[PDB]
Amino acid sequence: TLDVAAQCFLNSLVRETKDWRLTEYQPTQLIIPLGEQQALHFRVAYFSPTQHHRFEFPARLVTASGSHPVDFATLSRLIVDKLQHQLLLPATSCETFHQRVMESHAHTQQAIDARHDWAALREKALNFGEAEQALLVGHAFHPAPKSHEPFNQQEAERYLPDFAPHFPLRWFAVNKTQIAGESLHLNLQQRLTRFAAENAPQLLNELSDNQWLFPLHPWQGEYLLQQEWCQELVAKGLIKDLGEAGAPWLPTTSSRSLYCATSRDMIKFSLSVRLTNSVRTLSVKEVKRGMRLARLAQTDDWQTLQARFPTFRVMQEDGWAGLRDLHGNIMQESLFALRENLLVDQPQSQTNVLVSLTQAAPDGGDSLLVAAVKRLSDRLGITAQQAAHAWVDAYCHQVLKPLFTAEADYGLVLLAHQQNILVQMLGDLPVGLIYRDCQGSAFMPHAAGWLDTIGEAQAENVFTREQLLRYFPYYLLVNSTFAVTAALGAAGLDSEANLMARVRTLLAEMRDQVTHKTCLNYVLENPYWNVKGNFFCYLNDYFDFANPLLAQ
Amino acid sequence: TLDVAAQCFLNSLVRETKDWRLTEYQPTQLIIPLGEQQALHFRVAYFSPTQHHRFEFPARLVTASGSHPVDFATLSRLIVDKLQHQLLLPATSCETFHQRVMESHAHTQQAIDARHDWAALREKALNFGEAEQALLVGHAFHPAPKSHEPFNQQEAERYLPDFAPHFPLRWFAVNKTQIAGESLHLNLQQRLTRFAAENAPQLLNELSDNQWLFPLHPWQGEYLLQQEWCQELVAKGLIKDLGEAGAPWLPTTSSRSLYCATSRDMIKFSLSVRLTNSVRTLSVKEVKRGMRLARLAQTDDWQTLQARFPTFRVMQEDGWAGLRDLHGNIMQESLFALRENLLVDQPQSQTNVLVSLTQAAPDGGDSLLVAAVKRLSDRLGITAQQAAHAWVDAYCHQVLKPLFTAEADYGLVLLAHQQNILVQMLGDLPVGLIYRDCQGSAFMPHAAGWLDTIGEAQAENVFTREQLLRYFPYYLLVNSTFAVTAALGAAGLDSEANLMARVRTLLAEMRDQVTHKTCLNYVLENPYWNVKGNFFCYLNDPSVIYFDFANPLLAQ
Amino acid sequence: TLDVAAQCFLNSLVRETKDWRLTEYQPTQLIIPLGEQQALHFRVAYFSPTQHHRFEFPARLVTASGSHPVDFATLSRLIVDKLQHQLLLPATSCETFHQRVMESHAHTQQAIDARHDWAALREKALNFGEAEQALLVGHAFHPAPKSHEPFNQQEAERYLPDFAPHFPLRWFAVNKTQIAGESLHLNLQQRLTRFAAENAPQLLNELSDNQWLFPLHPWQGEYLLQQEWCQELVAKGLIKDLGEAGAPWLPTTSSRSLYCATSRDMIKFSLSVRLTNSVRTLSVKEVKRGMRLARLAQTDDWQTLQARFPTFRVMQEDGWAGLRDLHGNIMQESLFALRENLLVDQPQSQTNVLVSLTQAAPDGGDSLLVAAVKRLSDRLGITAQQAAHAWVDAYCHQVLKPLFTAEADYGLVLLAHQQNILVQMLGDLPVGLIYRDCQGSAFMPHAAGWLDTIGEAQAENVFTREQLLRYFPYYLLVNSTFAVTAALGAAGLDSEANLMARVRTLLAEMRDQVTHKTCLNYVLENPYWNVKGNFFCYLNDYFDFANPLLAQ
Numbered sequence A, C: 001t002l003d004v005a006a007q008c009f010l011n012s013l014v015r016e017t018k019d020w021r022l023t024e025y026q027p028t029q030l031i032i033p034l035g036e037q038q039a040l041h042f043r044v045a046y047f048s049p050t051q052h053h054r055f056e057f058p059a060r061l062v063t064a065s066g067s068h069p070v071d072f073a074t075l076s077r078l079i080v081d082k083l084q085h086q087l088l089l090p091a092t093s094c095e096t097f098h099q100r101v102m103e104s105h106a107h108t109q110q111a112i113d114a115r116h117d118w119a120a121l122r123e124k125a126l127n128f129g130e131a132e133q134a135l136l137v138g139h140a141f142h143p144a145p146k147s148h149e150p151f152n153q154q155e156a157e158r159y160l161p162d163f164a165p166h167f168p169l170r171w172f173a174v175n176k177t178q179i180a181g182e183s184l185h186l187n188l189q190q191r192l193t194r195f196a197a198e199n200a201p202q203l204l205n206e207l208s209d210n211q212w213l214f215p216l217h218p219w220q221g222e223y224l225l226q227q228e229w230c231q232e233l234v235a236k237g238l239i240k241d242l243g244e245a246g247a248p249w250l251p252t253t254s255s256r257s258l259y260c261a262t263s264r265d266m267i268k269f270s271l272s273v274r275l276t277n278s279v280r281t282l283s284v285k286e287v288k289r290g291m292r293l294a295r296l297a298q299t300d301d302w303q304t305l306q307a308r309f310p311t312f313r314v315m316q317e318d319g320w321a322g323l324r325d326l327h328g329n330i331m332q333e334s335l336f337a338l339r340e341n342l343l344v345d346q347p348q349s350q351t352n353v354l355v356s357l358t359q360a361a362p363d364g365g366d367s368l369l370v371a372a373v374k375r376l377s378d379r380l381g382i383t384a385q386q387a388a389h390a391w392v393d394a395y396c397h398q399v400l401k402p403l404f405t406a407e408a409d410y411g412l413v414l415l416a417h418q419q420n421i422l423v424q425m426l427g428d429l430p431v432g433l434i435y436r437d438c439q440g441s442a443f444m445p446h447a448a449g450w451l452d453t454i455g456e457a458q459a460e461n462v463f464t465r466e467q468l469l470r471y472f473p474y475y476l477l478v479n480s481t482f483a484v485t486a487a488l489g490a491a492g493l494d495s496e497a498n499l500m501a502r503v504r505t506l507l508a509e510m511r512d513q514v515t516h517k518t519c520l521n522y523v524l525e526n527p528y529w530n531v532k533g534n535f536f537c538y539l540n541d542y543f544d545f546a547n548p549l550l551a552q
Numbered sequence B: 001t002l003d004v005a006a007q008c009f010l011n012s013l014v015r016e017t018k019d020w021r022l023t024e025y026q027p028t029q030l031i032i033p034l035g036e037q038q039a040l041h042f043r044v045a046y047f048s049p050t051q052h053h054r055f056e057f058p059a060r061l062v063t064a065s066g067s068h069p070v071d072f073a074t075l076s077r078l079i080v081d082k083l084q085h086q087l088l089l090p091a092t093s094c095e096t097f098h099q100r101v102m103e104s105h106a107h108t109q110q111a112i113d114a115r116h117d118w119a120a121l122r123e124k125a126l127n128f129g130e131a132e133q134a135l136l137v138g139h140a141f142h143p144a145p146k147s148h149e150p151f152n153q154q155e156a157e158r159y160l161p162d163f164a165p166h167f168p169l170r171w172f173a174v175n176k177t178q179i180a181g182e183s184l185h186l187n188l189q190q191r192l193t194r195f196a197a198e199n200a201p202q203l204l205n206e207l208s209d210n211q212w213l214f215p216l217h218p219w220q221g222e223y224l225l226q227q228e229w230c231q232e233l234v235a236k237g238l239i240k241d242l243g244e245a246g247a248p249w250l251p252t253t254s255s256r257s258l259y260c261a262t263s264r265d266m267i268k269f270s271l272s273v274r275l276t277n278s279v280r281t282l283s284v285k286e287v288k289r290g291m292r293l294a295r296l297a298q299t300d301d302w303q304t305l306q307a308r309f310p311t312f313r314v315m316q317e318d319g320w321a322g323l324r325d326l327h328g329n330i331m332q333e334s335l336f337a338l339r340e341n342l343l344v345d346q347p348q349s350q351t352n353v354l355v356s357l358t359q360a361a362p363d364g365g366d367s368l369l370v371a372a373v374k375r376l377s378d379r380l381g382i383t384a385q386q387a388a389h390a391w392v393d394a395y396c397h398q399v400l401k402p403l404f405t406a407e408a409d410y411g412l413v414l415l416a417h418q419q420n421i422l423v424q425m426l427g428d429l430p431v432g433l434i435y436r437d438c439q440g441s442a443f444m445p446h447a448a449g450w451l452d453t454i455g456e457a458q459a460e461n462v463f464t465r466e467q468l469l470r471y472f473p474y475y476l477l478v479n480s481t482f483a484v485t486a487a488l489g490a491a492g493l494d495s496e497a498n499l500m501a502r503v504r505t506l507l508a509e510m511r512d513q514v515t516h517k518t519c520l521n522y523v524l525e526n527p528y529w530n531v532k533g534n535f536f537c538y539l540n541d542p543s544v545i546y547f548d549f550a551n552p553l554l555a556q
């Protein structure tokens, strides 16, 4: 009756198309014409003004003769055929698209079947690791959010968060000639030594002045070792495989970022896998973004920002390393970034990634957000609606405020979608924010003088005003705030319209306080936002979105 | 050199008198004239515009063509003698006052010598229980904050928090015909069942339809049991003494209130002991106030208030019980009230009573507040002054905001001591408030329509305007907020003057958002605050009992 | 290649028959003749003198015409067809037998597939709850150890240990007139009061002098509510259904017994479900046995026993309750027994039920027992064989000594198979015993004087010498000790023969210390043991066994 994987495909499509209808009569049905006098009739259980819809399955294909049910595989192929014919697309690109969609759908079902614990997650507050592996639906507005090529099923069970696995890292003993890297506070030799001593102490027999301990992802590790350039190093004895060892690491929502509860650092690997339309290798350019922001976090003006927003943290990526071939070429498939584990002293703190809270429950029950809101209602003795309002209000103050204000007053841009936002909670109420993913950092023109303080003002990741107004509202509101409000709306705690009214009101107060009102004005006043459409972007290996926050 | 006990006697005095002077020369000294061409000279290490002074000892007697040092016992006797002449005081009350001040001074020194763990508390964030037993100085502006009467040494070691003790409760099996009480959600029979079950399960072999388990304070219980009316019940078989049993309980800052980390309920006993000019027995009257507030907490307007401030909690005292004699008369010395333990599900949270944090270190080191702020600074990588400002700003938003708004918008008066304020912290930053002691709850006239909804419009704890303006700014700014700013000022993180400017700014923002501006107007604009002193109140078990306090928040 | 469910069926068969043979030539194959020049050949991977075999699959059916592979569904039909005519087995009975064998085989594979966390159990010492849900194979010598009629697949996932579920209890508020029961230390009213106050505190609003809180199994409670007699109680106002509430409970290896870490009591329910040829309802007679032993556990001679074996405890079932119909008749289907939770103060102790340790790994890897012995080896820096020896010797001293001695010196009989034996470990070495299930408690004639001290010398569960010698060695050696020695043997730590020699040598030393040597003499000297045919027993809704503990 329900299929959260199919809903992704359909909500992604409905958001990015103007061609679909609603029936005047009840029960309401959404209609996607296929042309040639036939159309798909979806029964609507919940209609969302932000297109967080929920359809009651199976769908029905309507014909001249009559009507008949169709499975997802069928209705999806009829849609890709339609788009191929009306929009005149290539054939080889449309079939590969449909194949990848079906793989994802199928992979989402296996993970649902495998995870019998998921429902029990509603029962109490989740820690960091629990939330990082609770996301089974994936990207709610991507057609194929769970494609993981080239991984097989055995590899997808060990190396993806979906099956809640854990594993020790792989380790090499590498000569320092063949180690490139960079790190703050501790030099590179000192990070690697600390990181090794706290995770795989028994390998410290291999540690010397020249021969350092190098961590690798177990899949990449085996994938790198076979390569000739790496095998050449083994021949010269500049690399020595130590195998797997040490503490348990669990893949996070991004799969390539790993978490260990006792390690002062998390580790983000260059991982040769396609995950929603991008191979997840790292570049030297990318890791220097993190190093850039990490150094900027030492300045006085950062000190001032942090003082003003003490409940707001950024998990700095202040270290990285990678292997050099025999020529000295940094092999980017061996790179990794080291990310501050700000939860190391509090591994049971209710700090959750937002995307896991807002995803629709695969069993059609409460979302993990709604669970938390319901606990908050019970604990405080207030109505579920009142608990919905308070949660939403605190979310604005704790999450949105520092993020808009970081741009407006300091020119710092943090592109914070659901998977980058960690909601620090205490008793299911947001009391802070931790931002993650420093590749999502950028700088406005009015941060240039501040960047000069570290010599970076010619930074690669500098945005123009037009770049800001494109990305920033989509990530923070469309791809964040409206999932919060939609999830609460789908559960019936309050209408999305009324909840977005609370968001609007608080964004207005926020505007009054900041210096550069450019962005908040665009958000609060401009009729149409740029929104990145994954449905047609993924089909090829941008649209205007009606702004709901305008004054009515 | 250091005496935090003497500083209480002296600072309390300096606040309630205008008969003292500073030296135009340095090192600066504070002078208290004794008349007859003699005076006491105190070396001032820190001068506070909120009278949180730090004197360097010994003092010095300035007399005849010369002086000499005087111990605390001497200078205090001299000052009490001065007061006996000035106010024509009965000699019996003077000597009772002085002996009590020495008792407190001595008891404090004992505790300080007994608590070698105290300095180590600076090392990390405190849990609720740790903070509740970390107060060794007591009331900072009371002359005898550690008077224990009639506790002996052994009794003070076990039943006060100072030595960080714990003990299981005493228990009576009592016929329901001799149990008077009340409870919400669960009836009285059901509370005592739950409470007895989760605290002393092994006594459930004495639980029946008619015979209920009844908890007692080990010291009160031994006293009540030696009474005539109680033994009538033992002879009648309506009371059986089961002795001590069950989980460990910690006396908190108030001594009569106990804490058990695994207990869903705290318990606040009627305790026949004198602590800062009040016998600590309960009355049916006072325990009804808790019920009144608890029943009011089920209303939709409370619900509305709670929604507006989700991080603000009140620990509801929604249950109480006591013993009645054979004639059915409630014996107030047996009373207790049950308080919600909102920390039962996280006993290791950084929820601390404010008074323990602000308290000046007995060893002269960092106060526990300064230890926190310093951790806040190091974690966030910000300056100690930036951490101090951040902590103070969050204190205003998390503590002062809900309390001033509850009175203004809803008419609810919560008289928040430094001891009734639990600061819910997360990473050494205030992120919420938990208020304790419902005996200090009162209602303004404009709460009347709301009290009607539960039929308590004629509540005894109703306050006039003048009552509010006297009490509320004393408890919540003088005996609370200024202790925060003073602690940080004394540590040299920023001047009290500057920190009090921050509070004013935020208090002024708030006034613009409330309905009844009556209270915040007074705070910000009334030149003087007329309140009640502890030093001359304690000396007398009316122009002196209450004194005018120069407002430091006036735009100057 | 590996099928642990099929191995239960086949080993159970080979143990209870003398019609099969072994091929001299290598690779060795076990042959089960079907007659008519037709037979099944099983490639043996491990031959066990205690019939804990491991066959390599698929099996191969051999005729004069040739050989071809056969799957488990086939070879099991062929074997039942054989047995059907060889025993003149009724056709309708045999069809039901094989249907339950395929159901068991199927449900097992579903559980293996569902439990992706099982392999990870090898990594560290298990706690009690983890072990209680680690048994996915079931009884290793029952033909259908995972048949759970009438449970459907949804009901199995929630109410059997197999999917590691947990849930809150169902609760009725019941007039004390309709409550039957008994308890020690606390009376019945007081136990139920305590049991409710620590497990479902929020239901205490319903508690009163006349209306008592009454716990139910979530399945059994619904099954009960629908019956006519219970409806009458609801109509009369004698019962009020409070629904589900309270702390989490996890079903143990027995399913009808539930475990809550925070509760001083475990609860054993009358459960109308068939688990290995026995519907799991309780009877009044059966819960008297627990009360009887509990009262006997308060005597001075029990004291004398306990002081001699301080590491040995029994989990006393010192309470029970049940509903009565309107006529005062105790309803057998509503019964439950309360059991001491002796682990309530150390929930993370390495106290594991033996059966989950000995069980063959579904994925063919190390057993959870061998996982421990290897930890023990690595910790002490001794050889795996030495650790195996130490573990076995420690098993004999901590488990076998107190149990034999209890019969010999006191006349107390505890029928301790693997599932009643909780091995108390410290650093993967046994250091104690906790016995469970007082239904398997009995008494010898020389215990009669001790029984007279509580007036229970007339007990129903008194054994004859013959009853003792039949049951005791099977449960306590065949279905306990030999699974340990066979798991260590199959792992290649040492031969079963050498490990069984260690057991004999210690049993010999034991016999010299006890007064009544009857039992140990029968174990050490009698050429044959009586043993249960769970196979032909299950076929029909026992047999002699060669003693390996003989001196040779």
Ligand SMILES: Nc1ncnc2c1ncn2[C@@H]1O[C@H](COP(=O)(O)OP(=O)(O)OP(=O)(O)O)[C@@H](O)[C@H]1O
Pocket: A138, A139, A140, A141, A145, A252, A253, A254, A256, A257, A268, A275, A276, A280, A355, A417, A418, A419, A420, A436, A437, A438, A439, A479
């Ligand atoms: N709503 C969402 N928005 C963005 N990403 C999502 C969403 N839902 C799921 N995801 C998943 O999260 C990942 C986001 O990738 P992104 O590049 O932001 O992180 P990363 O750099 O790979 O890892 P990290 O965040 O640890 O640095 C994708 O792989 C995507 O499948």
Ligand SMILES: Nc1ncnc2c1ncn2[C@@H]1O[C@H](COP(=O)(O)OP(=O)(O)OP(=O)(O)O)[C@@H](O)[C@H]1O
Pocket: B135, B138, B139, B140, B145, B253, B254, B256, B257, B268, B275, B276, B280, B355, B417, B418, B419, B420, B436, B437, B438, B439, B479
């Ligand atoms: N700064 C302070 N202000 C007020 N009281 C203080 C202070 N420091 C310590 N105390 C102690 O705390 C107690 C407060 O008395 P109060 O009547 O306000 O609370 P209570 O009702 O006794 O305690 P509870 O909070 O358990 O209800 C006094 O005994 C006093 O000695």
Ligand SMILES: Nc1ncnc2c1ncn2[C@@H]1O[C@H](COP(=O)(O)OP(=O)(O)OP(=O)(O)O)[C@@H](O)[C@H]1O
Pocket: C135, C138, C139, C140, C145, C252, C253, C254, C256, C257, C268, C275, C276, C280, C355, C417, C418, C419, C420, C436, C437, C438, C439, C479
């Ligand atoms: N090797 C084994 N020996 C005995 N029982 C086993 C074995 N393996 C699994 N089991 C399971 O253990 C249960 C044994 O039943 P038994 O009557 O001894 O326990 P019970 O009385 O139902 O439960 P409890 O032990 O909780 O009192 C059966 O349900 C059976 O499926």
Ligand SMILES: [Mg+2]
Pocket: A254, A419, A420, A436, A437
């Ligand atoms: Mg990311």
Ligand SMILES: [Mg+2]
Pocket: B254, B417, B419, B420, B436, B437
């Ligand atoms: Mg108080």
Ligand SMILES: [Mg+2]
Pocket: C254, C419, C420, C436, C437
């Ligand atoms: Mg059993």
